Design a protein around this ligand. Sequence first.
Ligand code: FE
Ligand code: FE
Lengths: 187, 183
Amino acid sequence: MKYKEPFGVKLDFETGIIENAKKSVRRLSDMKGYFIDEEAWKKMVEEGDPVVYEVYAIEQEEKEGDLNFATTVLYPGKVGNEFFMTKGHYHSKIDRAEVYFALKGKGGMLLQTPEGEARFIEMEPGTIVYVPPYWAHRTINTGDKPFIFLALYPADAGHDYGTIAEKGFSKIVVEENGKVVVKDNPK
Amino acid sequence: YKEPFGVKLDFETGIIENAKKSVRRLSDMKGYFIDEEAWKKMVEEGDPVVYEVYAIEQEEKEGDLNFATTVLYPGKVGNEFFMTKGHYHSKIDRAEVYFALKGKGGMLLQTPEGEARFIEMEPGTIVYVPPYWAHRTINTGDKPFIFLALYPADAGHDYGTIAEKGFSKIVVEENGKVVVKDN
Ligand SMILES: [Fe+3]
Ligand SMILES: [Fe+3]
């Protein structure tokens, strides 16, 4: 068979940008119905519709045993009292895992099982997080500076954004004299 | 369901909190370097450590992931730079991704057909090891070369082939980094 060529690409620790990577941008308007305070959401969109996070990805064909990787730049902010966060998802092939490596800023990862059992892992520069098979995951920026991290996952894992779009996570992460992880009313 | 977790990686030492540590000395690498005599000597001179690994692995299951940092110390066996043993995956189908954290070096890759490639690595470099390619890491500096590796949990290891055939190229120093044919 015809083999693929190996390669090296630079990752800027300060910006999170990966050379030759495919860039994706998610604005607040791309997250309709993800936040609890839908009025605060509407107001922020009309006021400017800021970018929530950008993604720089290098992915291969969806074949067993291969790997993809991507950095995410999650900007600081809140929709009411709820911290800026990624959309979150399960994998299409739900038993695929993922590994995250925090590079800059501060935040944490919210994970949950299909039953809604939740976990919240704090992340700071240098933190490596293991997302086990079957767990949905969402990253949260709980600071005032960009939260940058690298994600590595199986090329055939895919994304199930749908379940989350519909029901969301069982917990929401908000600010109240500190970082609070509480039950999600709509969940 | 397995438990998610976070562990701290030290950007300076490469040490990963709660990981399994392993060490490989020259004595653990018999028949890997070309200058057989320089090997015997350095081993009698107290075979020093070539590299250390801080690993966190899962059971050999499809779709899961293992990760580990390697601390590849500087030095040479003759004029041949300090390196890892190198290997193909049991399931040759599996790929791997490396992320350079400190020092300087490179990755030498090989296909079963005879094709070889050497990719330079420095802080920030991410290397994509495609399916079917055997790979070995080389330290071409005077300081420690530290990097993080991520690979499929079911990739496995096959040193046999390499341990016997070796790589088609060797990386040596001639007032500079030089990649040349091996025997
Ligand atoms: Fe994922
Ligand atoms: Fe490997």
